[PDB]
Enzyme design. Structure first.
Site, PDB file in Angstrom:
ATOM      1  N   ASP A 140      34.792  38.523  63.165  1.00 28.21           N
ATOM      2  CA  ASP A 140      36.182  38.230  62.818  1.00 28.21           C
ATOM      3  C   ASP A 140      36.254  37.727  61.376  1.00 28.21           C
ATOM      4  OD1 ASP A 140      38.745  37.274  62.473  1.00 28.21           O
ATOM      5  OD2 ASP A 140      38.795  36.111  64.326  1.00 28.21           O
ATOM      6  N   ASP A 198      37.127  45.635  56.068  1.00 31.55           N
ATOM      7  CA  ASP A 198      37.037  44.703  57.193  1.00 31.55           C
ATOM      8  C   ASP A 198      36.979  43.299  56.589  1.00 31.55           C
ATOM      9  OD1 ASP A 198      36.832  46.588  59.263  1.00 31.55           O
ATOM     10  OD2 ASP A 198      34.677  46.799  58.997  1.00 31.55           O
TER      11      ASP A 198
HETATM   12 CA   LIG Z   1      38.909  47.964  59.310  1.00 35.39          CA
END
Ligand SMILES: [Ca+2]
Ligand code: NA
Length: 320
Positions: free
Chosen positions: A303, A288
């Site tokens: 984000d 991520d």
């Molecule tokens: Ca991911």
């Protein structure tokens, strides 16, 4: 659009294990990140190093990055660069900041195993259980070929075994002895160091952040269970659209059972501490952090593109 991310010195994004600038010359390691930064006024270059290698040594990623930095300086006319590394990329960035302090303005590490990875210790241990040692040869060949095939330039300089060793906790400790940094705290203290360093008369702004989606939440009969806090329990689409989501939850579970504490799947919170620790609370797994597996992330994950963009603005305001 604007100059929100317009830093004085060019930003060089530095990938970690398995990486390259573009997998198979198709998939960007730093998914949509270079484009975002450039749209906001930043001059950005993406390093393409061996996906599998140690960071020090003649054939290591460190000398590779150093040579790359010099080509970026020559092409832009700049005198220094801002190094932003993910995972092992942070260790590679530290190497350059150490051996060529005059060419670096800052070092930012994202999910970097400054103290190694318990998962690396695990994998290395697994290979050790083969009394013939043949599995190390077979698996290495497999991983090295993977490196060559996915490398955007089909770089043949791949050494999976050296890479694995490099990421173990014992080896990482040695690396820190050979490449000390004011930005690092004492070994085994789970503390960071100073926000800046002055090497050979050159000052570097130091930063870091970590993803801690994998949290230990229950212990029974010696076994410790974890929870992926990046996702809405069970029904999160991220579990279906991004195969790395459940995979990192799995590797992260192995980590917690090896005493790692909160982690992102392969790097512990403590291992990632360096310089000015901006945050260790992001509900992110290791990929991520780089907006990976095509920008898919759990519903509770911040984000990553915005986080990096905001950091570029931070560097700008800091004068680099
Ligand atoms: Ca991911
Ligand atoms: Na600029």
């Amino acid at each position: 659009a604007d100059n929100y991310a317009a830093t004085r010195y060019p930003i060089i994004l530095v990938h970690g294990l398995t990486g390259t600038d573009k997998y198979a010359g198709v998939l960007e390691y730093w998914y949509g990140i270079q484009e975002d930064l450039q749209q906001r006024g930043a001059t950005v270059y993406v390093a393409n190093l061996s996906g599998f290698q140690s960071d020090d040594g003649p054939n290591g990623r460190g000398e590779q990055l150093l040579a790359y930095v010099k080509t970026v300086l020559a092409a832009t006319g700049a005198t220094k660069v801002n190094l932003v590394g993910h995972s092992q990329g942070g260790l590679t960035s530290r190497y350059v900041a150490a051996v060529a302090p005059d060419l670096v303005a800052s070092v930012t590490t994202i999910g970097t195993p400054h103290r190694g990875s318990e998962f690396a210790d695990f994998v290395q241990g697994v290979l050790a259980y083969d009394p013939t040692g043949l599995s190390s040869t077979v698996i290495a060949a497999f991983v090295n070929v993977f490196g060559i095939l996915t490398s955007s330039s089909n770089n043949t300089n791949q050494d999976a075994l050296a890479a694995l060793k490099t990421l173990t906790t014992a080896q990482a400790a040695t690396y820190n002895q050979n490449y000390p940094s004011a930005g690092l705290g004492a070994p085994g203290s789970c503390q960071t160091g100073a926000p800046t360093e002055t090497v050979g008369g050159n000052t570097h702004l130091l930063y870091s952040w970590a993803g801690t989606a994998i949290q230990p939440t229950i212990s029974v009969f010696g076994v410790t269970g974890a929870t992926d806090t990046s996702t809405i329990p069970l029904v999160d689409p991220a579990n279906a659209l991004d195969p790395s989501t459940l995979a990192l939850f799995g590797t992260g579970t192995v980590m917690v059972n090896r005493g790692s504490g909160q982690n992102d799947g392969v790097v512990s919170k403590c291992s990632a501490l360096y310089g000015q620790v901006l945050s260790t609370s992001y509900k992110w797994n290791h990929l991520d952090e780089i907006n990976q597996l095509l920008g898919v992330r759990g519903a509770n994950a911040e984000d990553p593109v915005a986080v990096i963009r905001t950091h570029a603005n931070r560097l700008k305001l800091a004068g680099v």
